[PDB]
Design an enzyme around this catalytic site. Sequence first.
Site, mmCIF file in Angstrom:
data_model
loop_
_atom_site.group_PDB
_atom_site.id
_atom_site.type_symbol
_atom_site.label_atom_id
_atom_site.label_comp_id
_atom_site.label_asym_id
_atom_site.label_seq_id
_atom_site.Cartn_x
_atom_site.Cartn_y
_atom_site.Cartn_z
ATOM 1 C CG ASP C 69 -0.919 11.003 -6.143
ATOM 2 O OD1 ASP C 69 -1.101 12.217 -6.357
ATOM 3 O OD2 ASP C 69 -1.833 10.165 -5.902
ATOM 4 N NE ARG C 288 -11.683 9.163 -3.757
ATOM 5 C CZ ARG C 288 -10.395 8.965 -4.002
ATOM 6 N NH1 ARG C 288 -9.486 9.913 -3.710
ATOM 7 N NH2 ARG C 288 -10.015 7.863 -4.555
ATOM 8 C CE1 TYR C 322 -6.097 6.323 0.572
ATOM 9 C CE2 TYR C 322 -7.972 6.977 -0.817
ATOM 10 C CZ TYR C 322 -6.686 6.483 -0.714
ATOM 11 O OH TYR C 322 -5.984 6.139 -1.858
HETATM 12 C C1 LIG Z 1 0.719 4.217 -4.087
HETATM 13 C C2 LIG Z 1 -0.245 5.329 -4.434
HETATM 14 O O1 LIG Z 1 0.089 6.268 -5.102
HETATM 15 N N1 LIG Z 1 -1.448 5.211 -3.851
HETATM 16 C C3 LIG Z 1 -2.546 6.139 -4.063
HETATM 17 C C4 LIG Z 1 -3.723 5.357 -4.671
HETATM 18 C C5 LIG Z 1 -3.505 4.695 -6.024
HETATM 19 O O2 LIG Z 1 -3.530 5.699 -7.034
HETATM 20 C C6 LIG Z 1 -4.569 3.668 -6.439
HETATM 21 O O3 LIG Z 1 -4.911 2.862 -5.278
HETATM 22 C C7 LIG Z 1 -4.070 2.817 -7.633
HETATM 23 O O4 LIG Z 1 -3.172 1.759 -7.185
HETATM 24 O O5 LIG Z 1 -4.767 6.233 -5.007
HETATM 25 C C8 LIG Z 1 -4.984 7.387 -4.127
HETATM 26 C C9 LIG Z 1 -6.282 8.001 -4.278
HETATM 27 O O6 LIG Z 1 -6.598 9.080 -3.764
HETATM 28 O O7 LIG Z 1 -7.106 7.354 -4.911
HETATM 29 C C10 LIG Z 1 -4.105 7.796 -3.179
HETATM 30 C C11 LIG Z 1 -2.861 7.014 -2.840
HETATM 31 N N2 LIG Z 1 -1.651 7.856 -2.719
HETATM 32 C C12 LIG Z 1 -0.672 7.510 -1.930
HETATM 33 N N3 LIG Z 1 -0.720 6.362 -1.182
HETATM 34 N N4 LIG Z 1 0.395 8.254 -1.843
#
Ligand SMILES: CC(=O)N[C@H]1[C@H]([C@H](O)[C@H](O)CO)OC(C(=O)O)=C[C@@H]1NC(=N)N
Lengths: 388, 388, 388, 388
Positions: C69, C288, C322
């Site tokens: 991710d 979602r 989101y």
């Molecule tokens: C830094 C990181 O990996 N951030 C994640 C975020 C995260 O898993 C949660 O907020 C837990 O901290 O979740 C998700 C998500 O779809 O829930 C996407 C974001 N992906 C990206 N920003 N690449």
Amino acid sequence: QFMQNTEALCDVKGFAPFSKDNGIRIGSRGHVFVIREPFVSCSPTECRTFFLTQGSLLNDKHSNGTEKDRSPYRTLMSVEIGQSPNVYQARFEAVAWSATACHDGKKWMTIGVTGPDAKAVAVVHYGGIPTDVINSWAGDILRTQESSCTCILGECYWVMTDGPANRQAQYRAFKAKQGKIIGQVEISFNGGHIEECSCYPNDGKVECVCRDNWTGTNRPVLVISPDLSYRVGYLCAGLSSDTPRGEDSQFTGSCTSPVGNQGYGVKGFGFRQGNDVWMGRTISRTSRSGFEILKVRNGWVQTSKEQIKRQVVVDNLNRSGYSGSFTLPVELTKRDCLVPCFWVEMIRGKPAEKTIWTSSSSIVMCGVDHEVADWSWHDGAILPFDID
Amino acid sequence: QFMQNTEALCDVKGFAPFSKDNGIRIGSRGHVFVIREPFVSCSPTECRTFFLTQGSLLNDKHSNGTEKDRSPYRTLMSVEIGQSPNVYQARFEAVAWSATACHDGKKWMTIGVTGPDAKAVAVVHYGGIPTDVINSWAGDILRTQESSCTCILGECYWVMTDGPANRQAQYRAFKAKQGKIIGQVEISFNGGHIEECSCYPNDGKVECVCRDNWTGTNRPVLVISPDLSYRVGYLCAGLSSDTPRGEDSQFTGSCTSPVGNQGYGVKGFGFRQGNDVWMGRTISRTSRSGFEILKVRNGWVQTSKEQIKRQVVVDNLNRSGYSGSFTLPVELTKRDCLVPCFWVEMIRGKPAEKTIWTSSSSIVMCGVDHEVADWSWHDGAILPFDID
Amino acid sequence: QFMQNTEALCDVKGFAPFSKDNGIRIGSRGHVFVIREPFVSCSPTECRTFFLTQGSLLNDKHSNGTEKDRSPYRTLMSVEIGQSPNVYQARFEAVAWSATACHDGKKWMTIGVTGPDAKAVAVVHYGGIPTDVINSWAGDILRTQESSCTCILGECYWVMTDGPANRQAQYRAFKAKQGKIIGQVEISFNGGHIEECSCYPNDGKVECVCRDNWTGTNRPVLVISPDLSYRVGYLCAGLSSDTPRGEDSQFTGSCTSPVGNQGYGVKGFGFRQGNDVWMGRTISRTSRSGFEILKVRNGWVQTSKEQIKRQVVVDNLNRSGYSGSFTLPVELTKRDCLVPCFWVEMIRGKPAEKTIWTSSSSIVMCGVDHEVADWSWHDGAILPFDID
Amino acid sequence: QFMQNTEALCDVKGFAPFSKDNGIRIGSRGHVFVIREPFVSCSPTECRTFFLTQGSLLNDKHSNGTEKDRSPYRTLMSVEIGQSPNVYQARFEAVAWSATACHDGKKWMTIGVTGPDAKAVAVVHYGGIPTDVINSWAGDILRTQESSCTCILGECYWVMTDGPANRQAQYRAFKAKQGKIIGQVEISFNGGHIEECSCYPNDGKVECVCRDNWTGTNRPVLVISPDLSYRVGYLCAGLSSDTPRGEDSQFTGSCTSPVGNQGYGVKGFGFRQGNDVWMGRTISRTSRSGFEILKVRNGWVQTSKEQIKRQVVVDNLNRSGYSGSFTLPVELTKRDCLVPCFWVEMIRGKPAEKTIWTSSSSIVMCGVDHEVADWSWHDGAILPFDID
Ligand SMILES: CC(=O)N[C@H]1[C@H]([C@H](O)[C@H](O)CO)OC(C(=O)O)=C[C@@H]1NC(=N)N
Ligand SMILES: *[C@@H]1O[C@H](CO[C@@H]2O[C@@H](C)[C@@H](O)[C@@H](O)[C@@H]2O)[C@@H](O)[C@H](O)[C@H]1NC(C)=O
Ligand SMILES: *[C@@H]1O[C@H](CO[C@@H]2O[C@@H](C)[C@@H](O)[C@@H](O)[C@@H]2O)[C@@H](O)[C@H](O)[C@H]1NC(C)=O
Ligand SMILES: *[C@@H]1O[C@H](CO[C@@H]2O[C@@H](C)[C@@H](O)[C@@H](O)[C@@H]2O)[C@@H](O)[C@H](O)[C@H]1NC(C)=O
Ligand SMILES: *[C@@H]1O[C@H](CO[C@@H]2O[C@@H](C)[C@@H](O)[C@@H](O)[C@@H]2O)[C@@H](O)[C@H](O)[C@H]1NC(C)=O
Ligand SMILES: CC(=O)N[C@H]1[C@H]([C@H](O)[C@H](O)CO)OC(C(=O)O)=C[C@@H]1NC(=N)N
Ligand SMILES: CC(=O)N[C@H]1[C@H]([C@H](O)[C@H](O)CO)OC(C(=O)O)=C[C@@H]1NC(=N)N
Ligand SMILES: CC(=O)N[C@H]1[C@H]([C@H](O)[C@H](O)CO)OC(C(=O)O)=C[C@@H]1NC(=N)N
Ligand SMILES: [Ca+2]
Ligand SMILES: [Ca+2]
Ligand SMILES: [Ca+2]
Ligand SMILES: [Ca+2]
């Protein structure tokens, strides 16, 4: 500085080829949007080709046309005149399954209409952002030009329709200044039908030549003043310019009434030329095929059938579609007058043709001071395509 | 401010490679237009490569060449010098199966010629829109340079032909100011034949070195003054520069007469260098293959066969094509003089090669103050392609 | 001149569709980046769509999601609002698997966070180059908004998190001027959890509505002043806006405490409207999917469940993702106030859907002075794709 | 206004990731050039990535590497830093199989070297056109930096080599002003070998750290003054930075002599930091794999082996390649000093890997005032590709 566009329209003797984008040809291998309703409009710097994608590309599974003529994926975008409506050259304008755009000398205005049939939303953009909204007032496919709107002294004008496809609907003009609707007028036209107007500036007013989709093989003419008083009637000339239409020798002109006993139509244009007119129509009276332009003497003021020029742009063996009007600005041409130009859309694919998809290409003609010889700048795509 | 281009042409000792676009190579996988007749021309800011597409792409079914050398789909477009003539980088110019373009210091002028053989239309554009039209005056494939035209004091000059491919035709020069033809002259040249001129500015006049497609293995020279008086004759040098041509040891120069007993030809260029000349030609006297440039002493004024430099740009195992002249503006080089440069087209495909299509790539050389060593910057595409 | 953004946020009655990029649809055949976390932000000239690629394209073997991710290939790029996140239109911003961007009136600022989980690096860029760095201070996936940051008087503000996904972490705000961090504050919030804030300017302060990923089905609100004093609590309104969340009739609001007994969440937004609020949420409380916006009376100040408007943008049969906040600048709208707009991401693919890849598309709504009718501008891609 | 670049180089404590273009990954499906030797250089407005194509694309039959490392199809092009070297975003610069580019504050200079091995031509461009030429003076693969050149007070400086790969060659520096070579110097260095210099401005002089391809596992340092006096020696530090190289514990530094008993090498960089130095090298002493940067105390002035920082950018399981130096201009950073940055090339394909082709991707690091944690931003392409 805002464009004046208060000059008289130039009196033109023929039309010269301006561009040909070859969208469908190129789109056989390149990444080009499936589109329909591709109109031309100009700023003080450039002419742009606007079009409504269906959020899909040519030769992709998503071009399959199980979708609606109006859909959620449809959008209004643009490219410099002559470029194909390709992904990588495209400027996003609005979400839309119907639209109008036009430049006021400072910025592009654009209005895309989207949402459900029963409650459409038209959103005015200006400088590249949403600035205002006009909701469906009659609950039945709010809609507008699919060609250039018209700005005069930094104010912009467009015609919309809301109501039945095939019986009496309701017709308003709007007046905008810098993306803010500052005026509208309800257009009285009982027994007549108005859609998809082709409008251009002339001697300080907007002139439009529109589509009657109910009873009339002749096109309505709507002339709107700065302050929104208007005249409405029909193209006086003793020739028919809608399709489907009847024979010419079966047809009597009218300044005030739809004539000919048919529904449906197609979008088209025409130019006031003092008292004369240039009027486009398809060469086939039954189909969207071939395209000609006819100059008629006194045809704007009388039910004349004195044709004085004709010029063919697409042959009767080849598909056409919509056509629409626009003018070249004085900041570009350096003339005493406003140069009239039209575009023609060349619709390819289903149901006419055995494919899953349907698209459109275009060619653009402009008014010049020398007659111009016949030919055909047709679309030229070899169908069907691989995805079919 | 309009470009002067009244400076003498610089005296040059060799030519350095400027660009190589690798169109066909890239076009094996990328989305690149099938083209022919790709010339270079410059504005005060940039050099652009112009070309005539056939409204199709490389490796697409539409590149199939059942079409006409002139067709409705053909268009003139452009890219920055060195870019391939690819869809996504391309600037649309005009509808055209023959063209000329050139910058006056303020804007691009462009003239694309289209329409039927019997009644062609050439449309002048300026600032990116149609501004004027010159119709076929002799009814037989109206046509022009396929290289840069030439602007001097904000006025622009070009040569057109109308008439037989292979016997006496008719030849006019035109003079334009901001896209408006303000002057023309009928060029007396009985027994001589003129097409596809390669023209450049020199000491306040246009100089051209053209193609005789009737009797002559030597190229006509036409020198035109601001006010349209002209001199016409043949390249004096005692070498032949057309193809097909005869041997060098079989050949006597002429200032006034086509010499050598053959038809056909190819487009090419050359540069007055005081009394000397640089002259391109193909290395093969029978085919469009290899490309050399030859400097001859007194060759512009006398039937000299004193060669003083030769420089090979494409080897005799590799395809060439058209070549043409242009100059770098003073606003770009900051010199006392106008820098001479040429392009070469490298034609690939049918009938020569076993493919359904035919295209062209290019390399661009410019004049420099140091001799330059031989090599070959050939087209390098591995044929045939997948669509074949 | 730096943007003020000290105006009150406009009070808005509905939201009009701004854009729809159709990334995934187009990406079936065109060359479009696999992405996630695509937010909108504006300069005085244009609105841009920023997104985090996974260094791969749609329908390519590299879209296979064996990757992290967060990965080394992930980057922050941008396109003009409405363009797909396609290779050929994309502007590179930063290396990043989490980011925030925003314009100060002169230049784009951008912060991409990359590096290992245990020791992430966030790099501030400004004018298109690295200007400063903030390293992980708590050793556990340093991270930030994934939406627009917020600049006020040429100073810029953003919220980051460092710590557990699912228990107490640590939360700082930062203050930057021309890419130089000139101030930070440690945000006391014990028992509460803050990630992915959606922030916008209002009456001279930054307002944010964020994600609690630990205990709370209600979103934290953080209001930060120029000088970095702040208020933190929860969205007062008596409706829940996180997912997963409980029923509405099972739910009591709180200004000070997470309520509802669940982990996880999703990023979302909301707008202070005097004492009222607009608040987005997914229509499904478990998934979602679908997207609505709800206006609640006094919902910013009291645990109100007086809903006064609701507007659906994506139907409950269709994927969402989101959502985030932004404002239109005064230099673009010419208003007395700051126009609120939101984007929604529409996540497609695995694990939900049977593909090897996962991506996201988007639609953008903006605040207007007229209510706006329901509809669904969903993503519309036919899955699975060829690579699957 | 011309760039000064007379400021001292900033003293930097670590390097932050700037960009990652993911060329090869994207090039699996998108239309990206096969390249090698991709360096970064900056203008007052933007950082651009320059690269040498092989006139072919990734996943096309023409990427087959039967061709020469130098060929006729090779060209120097550019893209904004962070974009892949893709066809549709690429700016053509020069014809070239070796090059250097750099901005003087007004325009890009560029020098591409092409032609045969025995008699190469290097052509200086300026403002986007050929302005000057330097021919092979020693008859054996004339060549230069493959990284940014260096302009100081509107004058530009670069190092070239002409001669054997593997024994004594000959080395000149050049000085250009607005594309006109106004000075050169023959660099005395008997027993030493110099190629591919990495140069940057520092306190009013050009500093370079180059490649010895004959006897030395240590890199030559050449420091050139405005007026072309110079110092030449070797990187003093008691660590080796070429590959192939020996062990560290087997190695004694030298300020004046190649040490280590091997041929070949690779291009790399390094930065004077008062008396200290940052020095890149591959982590493998035998292969082009992994990349680290090492700060050594007094390593610029003494054969120190006091390492004070190390920072890994690519892991030893992953391919690297060339590396090179550049600085951010003061017009972009607003600093007291010049920001040091380096790029690393990540070479993929044959002979190492079982494919027909060979290419390169890149990542760009910049100097920052905070240490920065290890990680790997490797190339990440899954090989082999479809064409293989
Ligand atoms: C830094 C990181 O990996 N951030 C994640 C975020 C995260 O898993 C949660 O907020 C837990 O901290 O979740 C998700 C998500 O779809 O829930 C996407 C974001 N992906 C990206 N920003 N690449
Ligand atoms: C084109 O689409 C045809 C009809 O598809 C069916 O109905 C539409 C509304 C959708 O629900 C679709 O998912 C259904 O399968 C198909 O029969 C046909 O396979 C399609 N053809 C191609 C070439 O994609
Ligand atoms: C190339 O085209 C060949 C000739 O096509 C025939 O004649 C032209 C003028 C058109 O009428 C065309 O539709 C006719 O079939 C074909 O024989 C051949 O299949 C084509 N080859 C490829 C690879 O497309
Ligand atoms: C998608 O990737 C699947 C898993 O791949 C395996 O594990 C990853 C982490 C890599 O090490 C990869 O090289 C391994 O093979 C594969 O099983 C599958 O083939 C892939 N599917 C497609 C369509 O590419
Ligand atoms: C890659 O090229 C290989 C070698 O090609 C041969 O030698 C070169 C110099 C050329 O002359 C070429 O035309 C010759 O056939 C081929 O053996 C091989 O087929 C190629 N592989 C692919 C995938 O294209
Ligand atoms: C709003 C709408 O769907 N407009 C239609 C239009 C319409 O069917 C008739 O004018 C009846 O009102 O017809 C056609 C048509 O080809 O006839 C295309 C337009 N398509 C689009 N603009 N998308
Ligand atoms: C107008 C036209 O078709 N011009 C031709 C030209 C022509 O056949 C001869 O000069 C006879 O007049 O020949 C050639 C040619 O390759 O010889 C290419 C040009 N093709 C194009 N310009 N499209
Ligand atoms: C001019 C030339 O071909 N330069 C070579 C360079 C060269 O082989 C050695 O430095 C010997 O002089 O080596 C390499 C290399 O990977 O080692 C790449 C460069 N390739 C290109 N610049 N195209
Ligand atoms: Ca009708
Ligand atoms: Ca001849
Ligand atoms: Ca939660
Ligand atoms: Ca070595």
